[PDB]
Amino acid sequence: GPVAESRCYTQIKVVKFSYMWTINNFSFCREEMGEVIKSSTFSSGANDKLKWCLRVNPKGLDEESKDYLSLYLLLVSCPKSEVRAKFKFSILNAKGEETKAMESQRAYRFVQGKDWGFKKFIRRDFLLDEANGLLPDDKLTLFCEVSVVQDSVNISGQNTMNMVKVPECRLADELGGLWENSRFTDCCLCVAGQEFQAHKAILAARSPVFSAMFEHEMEESKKNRVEINDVEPEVFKEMMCFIYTGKAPNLDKMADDLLAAADKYALERLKVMCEDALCSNLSVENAAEILILADLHSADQLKTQAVDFINYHASDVLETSGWKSMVVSHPHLVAEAYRSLA
Amino acid sequence: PVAESRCYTQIKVVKFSYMWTINNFSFCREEMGEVIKSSTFSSGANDKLKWCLRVNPKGLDEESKDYLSLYLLLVSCPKSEVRAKFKFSILNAKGEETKAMESQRAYRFVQGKDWGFKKFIRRDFLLDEANGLLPDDKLTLFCEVSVVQDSVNISGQNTMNMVKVPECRLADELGGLWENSRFTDCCLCVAGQEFQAHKAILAARSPVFSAMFEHEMEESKKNRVEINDVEPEVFKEMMCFIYTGKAPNLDKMADDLLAAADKYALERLKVMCEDALCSNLSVENAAEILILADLHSADQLKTQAVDFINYHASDVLETSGWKSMVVSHPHLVAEAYRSLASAQ
Amino acid sequence: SSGPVAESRCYTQIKVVKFSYMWTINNFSFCREEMGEVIKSSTFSSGANDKLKWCLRVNPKGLDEESKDYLSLYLLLVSCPKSEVRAKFKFSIL
Amino acid sequence: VDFINYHASDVLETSGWKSMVVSHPHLVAEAYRSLAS
């Protein structure tokens, strides 16, 4: 009989706030299918750093909602946690009365960026009728009543943890103190003539290839000077403030060469997040470039995801000149993708 | 009126475990529901969310008088819910799980809430020497948890693909300079014994050390310094915190590691040690913990110890520790009297 | 002169922060506080905001002669930042 | 002791209370016991 009970009486902590959104001249939106008009971010006040926003598509979506208005709640930001809220939508008529009130049957789970809403919230034709009084002076006033269930436990039998307020994992900030001040390094690198100073311990620790050049045949004769003459310095600076601080801010802007740098020195972890970054920038017009880069440098996750994307979207990739050039010059990449599609 | 998401959600499942042994189980002798709790264990990545395990040696009440109830209790979290799923098993002498017991669905946790299995196993059947579940009368239990986070596809074009980042092992790589010892630069010394360690990480992570290395030492004696104020069995833990960024063997030896940390201003280890002492508070030694927390300039520990003494002045007053703190350290007593006066 | 009802110009919308607190009186038959003597709880708070701090309060034998043989339970607001709360409450015995 | 229990708000600043803290601990402890309880 596998079961599990709590031994603590079920207690709940509900925070029930609301929000009133007014849209001026709603019938002037140019009302194109798939459009979105997001509200300004709102919060209860006791939110605990948690921001919502409604979202209206004045024309519906796909097929069944073409003559409907869809209203979705959206959790814009939250401190990396799941939120369990109970939302209600309604429209205030000219007489200040809730008319189209329909709630959410149970509490629905929200996480940052996830939007819960009701498709076909209201018939657009009925909404625009002037006999209903729903648009006084063509002004749509939406009303939302959120209810953030939290399911806390609060008992008198001691507070155990009480107030901890422990510091967050700031192990990057201290590491980031060895680089700008540069704090008396030991060995000198070189990126195509320019001069940079950097250590040996962290490099050897986080990149085995660095350890194999530095320990083998150089520590006796050429210990001070090595020339890394194959990468541009503008991305080497990002590479060795990733090796040091453990995060790369300016990665998604220039992720094309960070993959090359990471795979050259076999930093597998840096290779995988960079592959993730490239995979998120996939498009039909450049899926060939991402796949070729993922094949030349022996990537696997990016290769698999690019092959799957091209398999799904072979309808229009075939027309692009990049695909024809790679097909004419390097046949063997086409054969495994063809085999996968088989 | 059924809401729909119109988005793609990744069902992320973070999994971890913590093997745990209780010493001399057959002689614990805590009956009628008296709990025997463990020491808090984190979930590897994200140490701001600490778990724990709980046991009742004899199942309370008449219905479970013969079994051994088992429970998993969350201790701290950043005011949010977790959705763990847990499995309990016993490792025999060979280390193979025998009495596996499964949870059929993900359970929802919050700070202080404890889910687990009542009537987990019969103690008499487990005490049977034929089964061999007690080598050296030890009781080893393995707890396997699986936290479900359910992130939503990283907002971007298309929807997403699968397999996210594999939780980069930054901490261990930083640590990897100590056990293998990986060609250091300067030589320490702990009461004659020889240790090897770097300078960059020390200066980065401990301001008192940073002020030590540059002023008057880097010119003449840069290689060698002799440290004659701490014992090596805890020096190993400080110098597996500075490198690996976490202290496993913390709740056992938190008494002198606080003194060492406050001497060299290691704030983060100081606060975790303060949490460890605060969770080990008892009436028989609150005076000693308060004396250590004032001498070594702890703040949170003085506040929590004074509050604990305010609640439990019924029996703390009888303890010899209270007489010692009254005779030897008056101004802490005066500060406690102001804490009570502010509360009263 | 005159003075009818004052308008608000805004729609009426309210917040409700509903939490709970479970309080256990161990060995309640041995507490033995006589007539008119209180037993105050430990300070508790909501969680949304800790500005407001509450604490229950029992008189094991009811105060005043009307409540001679009754349990009198009260909710008390220990500390607030110089402002007036409008809380609702309900007690019950498990 | 009762007077100090009611009026511990301002006695703490006075030099006399500090004199008892440095010189007579057990009186401070007894006052604490009375205010507790």
Coordinates of C-alpha atoms in Angstrom, one line a residue, chain D residues 4-27:
Chain D
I4 CA 14.0 48.2 37.7
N5 CA 11.7 45.6 36.0
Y6 CA 9.1 48.3 35.2
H7 CA 11.7 51.0 34.4
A8 CA 14.5 49.1 32.6
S9 CA 13.9 51.5 29.6
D10 CA 16.2 54.2 30.9
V11 CA 18.2 52.7 33.8
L12 CA 20.5 51.0 31.2
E13 CA 22.1 54.3 30.3
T14 CA 22.9 55.2 33.9
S15 CA 26.4 54.5 35.2
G16 CA 25.1 52.7 38.3
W17 CA 23.7 49.8 36.2
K18 CA 27.0 49.5 34.4
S19 CA 28.7 49.5 37.8
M20 CA 26.5 46.5 38.9
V21 CA 27.2 44.7 35.6
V22 CA 31.0 45.0 36.1
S23 CA 30.9 44.4 39.9
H24 CA 27.7 42.4 40.8
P25 CA 26.7 39.9 38.1
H26 CA 24.3 37.8 40.2
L27 CA 22.0 40.8 41.0

